[PDB]
């Protein structure tokens, strides 16, 4: 997989499009908990198909994922919601307006999520740009538990370079990067809400989802 950093970027970009996870169905706070648990599984194998990722030590792979997983989930909801208006596509069969989202026990999260969505709508994000950006957010982790900082930085750099190379086929990359602060704040809001749900103890949550909330 690392050879995708050495050739032309179109090969890298097509690889990222091919390993995009397929549409998920959800089958109403317990619905999202179930759906988010399953998207963590999907996200883990997605990460493994990102060139460079599997060359990190396992414990650093762990640290990255447990600090960015919600950023990747939230960015997926955002790309799926880009063509819609005041609605959030959590799944193929779970589209929700702001009112619909209060009712599924999300409080103000719908508003937070739509703020991200509007910011990406303003950019007219392409599908190619999204998968490079998603990979780049993975690699921009900032976990306190990272051991080989230099290795994570090196992977970050290649993905950033890939975005630059892609955009040159020229202020556009930076515009993309300037939506990352909002992506990370939004993800942290989603996290705080579901950590609150953990404490209530009403809604049952699967092992993996609990483990990632603890981290």
């Amino acid at each position: 997989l690392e050879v995708l950093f050495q050739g032309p970027v179109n090969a890298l970009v097509s690889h990222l499009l091919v390993v995009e996870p397929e549409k998920l169905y959800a089958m109403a706070v317990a619905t999202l908990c179930d759906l988010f648990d399953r998207e963590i599984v999907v996200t883990i194998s997605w990460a493994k198909s990102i060139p460079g990722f599997s060359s990190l030590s396992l414990s650093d792979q762990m640290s990255v994922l447990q600090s960015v997983w919600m950023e990747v989930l939230v960015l997926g909801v955002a790309q799926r919601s880009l063509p819609l208006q005041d609605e959030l596509a959590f799944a193929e069969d779970l589209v929700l307006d702001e009112e619909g989202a209060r009712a599924a026990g999300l409080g103000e999260l719908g508003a937070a999520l739509l703020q991200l969505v509007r910011r990406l709508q303003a950019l007219r994000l392409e599908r190619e740009e999204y998968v490079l950006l998603k990979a780049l957010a993975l690699a921009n982790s900032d976990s306190v538990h990272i051991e080989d900082a230099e290795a994570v930085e090196q992977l970050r750099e290649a993905l950033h370079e890939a975005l630059l190379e892609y955009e040159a086929g020229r202020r556009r990359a930076g515009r993309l990067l300037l939506t990352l602060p909002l992506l990370r704040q939004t993800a942290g809001k989603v996290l705080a809400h579901f950590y609150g749900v953990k404490l209530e103890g009403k809604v049952p949550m699967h092992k993996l989802f609990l483990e990632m909330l603890e981290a």
């Binding site: 599984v41 883990i44 194998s45 493994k48 396992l58 792979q61 762990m62 994922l65 447990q66 092992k207 993996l208 483990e211 990632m212």
Partner: peptide, 9 residues
Amino acid sequence: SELLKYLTT
């Protein structure tokens, strides 16, 4: 740990 199991699959 659950995470370790899916990573090392």
